[PDB]
Amino acid sequence: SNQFINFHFMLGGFRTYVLERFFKQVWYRRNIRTFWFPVLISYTSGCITMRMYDNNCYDYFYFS
Amino acid sequence: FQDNQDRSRVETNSATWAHNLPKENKFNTETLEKQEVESRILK
Amino acid sequence: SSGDLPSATLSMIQQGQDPKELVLQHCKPNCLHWEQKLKRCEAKLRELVNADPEMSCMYPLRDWVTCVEACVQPQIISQLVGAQKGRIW
Amino acid sequence: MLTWISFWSLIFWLILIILVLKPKNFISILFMSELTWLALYCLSLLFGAIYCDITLLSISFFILGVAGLEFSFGILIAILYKNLNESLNTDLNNNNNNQNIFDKNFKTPLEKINWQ
Amino acid sequence: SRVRSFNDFKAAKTYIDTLKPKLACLYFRADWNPLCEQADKDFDKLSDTHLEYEFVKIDIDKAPQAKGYFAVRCEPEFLLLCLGQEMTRQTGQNQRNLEHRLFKVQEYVKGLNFPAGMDTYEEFHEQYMAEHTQLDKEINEWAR
Amino acid sequence: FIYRDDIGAFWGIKGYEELVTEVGTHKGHNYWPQFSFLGTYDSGSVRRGFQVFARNCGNCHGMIYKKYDYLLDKAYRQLELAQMVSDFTIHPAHQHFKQYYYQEWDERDRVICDHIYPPYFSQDQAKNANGGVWPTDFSKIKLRPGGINYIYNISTGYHFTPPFGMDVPKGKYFNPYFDHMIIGMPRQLVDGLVDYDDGTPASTPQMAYDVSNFINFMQRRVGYKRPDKMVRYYMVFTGGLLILPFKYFKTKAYYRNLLSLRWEMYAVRDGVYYNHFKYGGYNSRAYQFRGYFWA
Amino acid sequence: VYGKLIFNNIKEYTPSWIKTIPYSQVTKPILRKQPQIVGKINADPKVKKFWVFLRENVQYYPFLWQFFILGTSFVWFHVCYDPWLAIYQANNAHRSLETALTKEKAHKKKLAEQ
Amino acid sequence: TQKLDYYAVLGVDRLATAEQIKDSYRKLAMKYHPARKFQEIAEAYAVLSVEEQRRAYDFLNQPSPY
Amino acid sequence: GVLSEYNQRLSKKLHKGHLVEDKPTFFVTSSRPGNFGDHIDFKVNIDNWFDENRVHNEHETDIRRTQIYTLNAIYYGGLLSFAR
Amino acid sequence: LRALEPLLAKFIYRWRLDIAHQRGLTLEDSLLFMDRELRRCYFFETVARQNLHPYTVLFMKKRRARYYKVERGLRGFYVPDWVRKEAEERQLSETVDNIFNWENFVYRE
């Protein structure tokens, strides 16, 4: 009852606080560094395999 | 909204390469301190 | 004042007629690629004296029909009674 | 290692970029403008040879003439800089603080501001 | 913090370069100036008061080379450095002005932003020598 | 994670390569008022659709799971619906569950609370009457490719010839929207077949649109209840969005306020040993660790 | 990070080689009243009067506070309910059974007097 | 409370000696000793009396002229 | 106004977005027991939120308590509307 | 392994070192006593209570707390330079001494 109701909420403004702190320091630094590489590899490989399987299906269905 | 208390513009920029600590304004009318003059006179 | 005035044009939907044949024969140029592919498939299947029953011109025709009705169906519905949009959205 | 056409187009535009880049000294800008005219001279000759066109060689010598007249004007304008109280470095002709210059410092011609 | 006293220039320089302080205050003193007696007490008081700086005192008489290395002109001198770069310099004896300079430098540095990997400590002369090879070297190659 | 579009399997769902499926929804956009944003059913459209169903479609198909009084308050009034339903007759053999309630033993006029039964007594009778095929029940016809668009497309789309290699036997017709493109339904909707009560011109697309609207209206989870539920979804979304700031205040601001502590550590050298640290400690899982772990 | 391992032969809670902070380097407390951080609305004496009244007459009676919470829930429901229903009903005015019946009656009158 | 200017309260300029501050406080204390204004005077003099406290107060202000 | 509050909060000096102390800071409780010696040379606090997180409303605290009750009541009212 | 040395140096040693320095810690706090040992490990607690002085685990916990008090309140926290410098003052040789001595003591006793 002797403190801020919302302390430190938007110090530095939208740009500094939200962009820098939230995105770069939390989201990127704590999540994307860890999984961007394996997730990218898995997504690309899955897309390639699905495309090959669909091409085999297309060859099965269409003879011309 | 126009704030008349803010009188800064591109004309008043006072960033110099030599001074690592930027000066208060762009008027180079800073005088020496009393102790510096006395010490140099003693020298 | 509009609504209390006579209508200048009477479409054939408003005459209780089906324009679907005209719309089909007008949406065909939009899907010439699929139509040509279906013709080529039919020509290829005709030449083979013996063919697997799994082989048919059914799928090229399915694609061509899909394209033609993609062109055709919405514009016929858009003129019907009860297909008007809402007052705001 | 680069084709001459692309090389010379890029050279002309890079010369213009470097002319803009360098500090605004009138003599330096004059020299770079002469270099720009010479690059145009070379490009015109190259295309004249490629396309078997005789008008571009004319462009070469007309560039020579235009550049000569422009250089004469530039020499006279610099000597005019002498007589007026102006510096050949234009960045020293204003009080706008510039971080690119180590020693830019101007103050009012007063010995002191306050008397009492 | 607490004043670190030095009489040898090499030892003091090695200590400062090993510490690599973010904010440092160097007090160069000599015995020719009678006012240096009060400057010692002022330096001690400000050192115990302030904890963000590292306070190093150098006796110029016992370490003359230090003077030449630090461009000391008129003792007593208080040199305020940030990451080894000269923030400011004060000549003479006055405690209020010294505290004001310390406060100003502290707040300005606290309001600063440094890109990652470019906030390392550097030696003093490193700033002078960087501009020397940029200006003085070429001038000496034209006149001589 | 990416699927082809030219193999006939929409979005990776396989099994429907033998018919046209995406016309209503994916390839082309058929507008239905009840499926738009803040849209609802058209009462006149549903009314005309029920008229079409009663006059033509109900002579072969049925909606066993549903009764006539679904149309109350949205398409018909009680009295007019009563006469219109009474235009048809029902039998005790029609009833799926003829308990003691249905004490009749002959034909009688239908009532609005009766299930919508076909004129046939049984599915086998329907098959026998319709040349071996059964007119499908419309109770759950929503689970067809493009749903309401499926009904509309089947009603239309009798304007093509089979390709080479496809043979259409007698009693069957070519329809690209039906499975295997061979259907046992002759073309039903002809121009001017049904005389509308409201005077709307009666064309084949109009009747197909109306009957599709009616059949979709009778459905569950997609008819006569979806629009109000979407409005409820919008209201709940607005409530959550407006309550987000107060949740942030309470939780995050309270935590940040509680974590604003001051800590001080001092030197204690009064000659007292830390016997409580050396000879202290409790563990609730000691009953598990004892006798087994670290002996 | 600080030093070698310490075993139980030291017998003192703070070992002699742990440095202490002299009192000259300790931050002294501030013993004066700082200006309040308040907004324009809450600095109004009328708003303070309202807060005092609300506290003393509703907050100090827990069941009255529960009635206050019920009122807040009522306001929440009506705020989230009324506008969506209003716009939804205004959007579909022309798609009503009353409009359909009006058209049917007009057509019936025309056909009768035809 | 609200932000307060101690030099304005004591009626002295920033570059004033300590004895000037004492004299100003005594002159203002003879008048309002027997509420809010006297409290402001007391707070300003308490802050400005100590050299360290006055220096710390002056550093944060960064005064403007006039 | 909200614009004014944003304007004051825009000028705060921070270290990579966090309001933390720029120097080591030590505090001593003057009324601490005599067996407690001096502060050990360990930086126990990086921040100063105990002093920075203040509104200085010690002359009116029940008002802030009532405001916190009101915010809690609004949150509970939304939850209770859904439960109803 | 000798051909793979630069990758291991970049992605194992330097990765953990950078994360620890950002948190204001060193490889001490991640390699001397594990996280699962400082909390809910009756064997480690018994050995520490029977042989160790309180300040070891206490100082490690104090560093963790001084970081996470700010981190929990406002996430994405980088310690200032005066904490990172204190962290960087400690080298890996003393950490190796501590780790080896602790492991040998635990085994032997």
Ligand code: HEC
């Ligand atoms: C009796 C002659 C019928 C009338 C009148 C209507 N339909 Fe019909 N329909 C009939 C049969 C015998 C069949 C089955 C064909 C087969 O080969 O299985 C059908 C089928 C349909 C379907 C297909 C449903 C499916 O299971 O995929 C639809 C959508 C359909 N009928 C609609 C429909 C409508 C809207 C009618 C009123 C205009 C209608 N039918 C009349 C027999 C008869």
Ligand SMILES: [Zn+2]
């Ligand atoms: Zn055409």
